Amino acid sequence: RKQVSDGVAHIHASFNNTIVTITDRQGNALGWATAGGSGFRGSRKSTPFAAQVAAERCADAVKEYGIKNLEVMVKGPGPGRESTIRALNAAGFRITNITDVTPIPHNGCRPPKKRR
Amino acid sequence: FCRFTAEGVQEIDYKDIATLKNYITESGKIVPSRITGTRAKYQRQLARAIKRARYLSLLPYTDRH
Amino acid sequence: SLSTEATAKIVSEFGRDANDTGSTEVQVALLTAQINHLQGHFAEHKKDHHSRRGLLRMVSQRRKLLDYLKRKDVARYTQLIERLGLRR
Amino acid sequence: MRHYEIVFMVHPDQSEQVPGMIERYTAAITGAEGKIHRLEDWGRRQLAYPINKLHKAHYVLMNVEAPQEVIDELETTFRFNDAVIRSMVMRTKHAVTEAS
Amino acid sequence: AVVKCKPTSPGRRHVVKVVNPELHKGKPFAPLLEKNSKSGGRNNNGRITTRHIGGGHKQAYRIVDFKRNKDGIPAVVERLEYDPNRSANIALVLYKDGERRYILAPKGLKAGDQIQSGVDAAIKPGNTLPMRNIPVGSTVHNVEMKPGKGGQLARSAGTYVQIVARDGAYVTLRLRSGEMRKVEADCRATLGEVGNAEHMLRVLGKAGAARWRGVRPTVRGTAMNPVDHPHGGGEGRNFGKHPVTPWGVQTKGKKTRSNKRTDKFIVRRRS
Amino acid sequence: IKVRENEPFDVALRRFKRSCEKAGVLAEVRRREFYEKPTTERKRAKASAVKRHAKKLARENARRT
RNA sequence: AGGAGGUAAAAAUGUAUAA
């Protein structure tokens, strides 16, 4: 219901999965889907094919809102970063513009050291 | 020798926002001396100039605020 | 720092000539004004170790000149320090 | 007797009340023999990034010459005043003219 | 000055005494001095209500002016005096129209400074003005509660209240302990920070420094007999009951704050 | 950063982000403070740059290629 | 020609005499 026209698809793609969230023009969420939520957890979860499928799982579940134009705002150094938006082109949507809002700290908190 | 200010010698002012626009990237970063080939004196001169203009909201810190 | 105005005053008081700005008399007097000027700076901060070295370096230079000046002009020497108030 | 280049923002509303603002500042400086040199009111200029609210602002450029005592007190009048936003104060370098 | 007293005798080994050479020596200002007979912790009924208070050197209460009901009249701080009633230091202050009253001494106060109270007073440590003309985010002490009551927050040695925000009719500030209380905007306050911050390091030393100040000995729970206190008894140092007060109330862990008529004011509790 | 290329774009057409930061800072700030290894690796990096300049000047040999 | 992203679980030991 609610009949909204615009839509901002935030795509948080990290090194493990691609949680995708289609919000409204203001910020209120309107349904989402993830890599794992599609049904395949593990090594497969972090693949460009995962983000592909993620878009389809979120291609529907927004049909009640009948969104037309999008403002994709990708976020994160994930492997699904680039493949997810092309999945939205074929999904039958119109990307108005693409924006990148990756948090680039100006020497903020010290990062962890979790790897060797 | 792709300079600009090196010929037109002057103590670079932050007020010349048109001039400084050419030295910043569309994102808002400071283009390095390796690309513009600017003399190092005028580069550090430019750096303080930019940051002061940055402080006065004459230049963006980034694309999204 | 020793501002320029104060500098010309000191020279025109100890130098034998108006331009005589190299005499040992003058250099000792010159640095002494500076060291007294730095006591205010080292009364607040008391942690600024780098310019602490600046002060310490110029004290030894003052020390060496009086060593020199003594051994050469004994008479002149006692006159100088009583006009500048130091040594103890 | 330094030379300063005071630059400060003004919240739009008080922009309507800006001439009297400068008149008070230039009086204190002149009150202590401070020779003023520029008085370029940039006017209501749009900002780059929002300053807590306000997508619009008003600038005032000074380029004044004054003694250190006065300038320290005059800066405090920017601090405790809820009209002046971001006050910049730089150093001499042979005070200028026409600057823009 | 924080001076370590030299160990001449066993008893003066740990006396780190706070000496402040600026303190006025001699007799304090007579007209603002009234008696204060101690009561040793005994109410109208004569029974001991609050324990541990008794003895102590004879004190003399001094009328410290908190209300600060003078507007637009300058004042020249005369000198800094000592006052046994509190931890802070009071300052004999003289107004332009020849009148002497005491006030808490801010830390940026020297003998002979210039302060004034009122709405038109300039922002300077020692001035007293309402919480509507203070810049949001400064350091304030001697905060009032109701408009014209007098002042009851942060008046102890080295204490200051941060004014966090200001939401129109209310000024959300933050007490020293950690709570963020929301008080009436029209309440008067005093800028700066209460002096004598070395009071923290003042370690008593021998029992006397505690005893002649007023604190009587405290007798522990595991020492008293079971007929006198919920703890103790035993054949030899045997605790085992849950730590309680002498009247059967769970201590060391029980919230006891209950007014309800002020919860409308308490924004965030101490943590 | 940002891209619209108004009407006829139809493709991603944004590799210019690679030209700004996009991964170069994220894969750099994801962990490892080091505090002084970049000093080590930058001295190692510019050492390799001069290896090229040495090799550039050392290209003037036959080899029959 | 010049720069960026992505690529690697576990696996211990061998005494004491030869030019």
Next chain:
RNA sequence: GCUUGAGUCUCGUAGAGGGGGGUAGAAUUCCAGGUGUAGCGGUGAAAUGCGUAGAGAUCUGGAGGAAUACCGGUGGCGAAGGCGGCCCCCUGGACGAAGACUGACGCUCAGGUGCGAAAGCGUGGGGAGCAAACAGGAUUAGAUACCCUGGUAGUCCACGCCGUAAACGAUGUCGACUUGGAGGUUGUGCCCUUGAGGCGUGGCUUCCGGAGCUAACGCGUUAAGUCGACCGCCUGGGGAGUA
């Protein structure tokens, strides 16, 4: 006595040199509220942990603390340790120009005095993130380790103390001399700045190489070459820089 040693003054230039006080934005975390729904987070694969009490994702607002992307460069500065947002106040050292002045005032330096990263310690504040200890889950023959979710002292500030490091160009300081090349940085002079130049003259600094030297590797006008002044230090390893 003299001036080429050393030092002072006049005018300028560059600089993350040091101390003190303000301030801006980005990002993490937390708290309050809206939308919204089954996973999220994590790994080589997992699990502990978070999550139908409604997380993660997203947005509005607010609280805080620490660090200051890009500039940034074998780039600069300091005696060394070291020092990087921006602004002000206080202040040191270097370098150059063209003159003036003092007239050996110089070099080194046992003992002595001061400075001296990080860790640690005392007292008082602060505590986002990170993170010894430690707990839990994995991996493992076992894992008190690497890996993972959490997490304290500490990391931060103020005031004192500690005086060690591969505190390293493993090259003590100072002065003189002995072919070159490519740079970077910062001055300055001359000619037509006619035009991003042309030709010089100084400091600092990187790299490559000749003679020479070295056991060789390599060092090579900022020497480990050729000489001088002075000080520190070594005399097989282990025992031990310990009793």
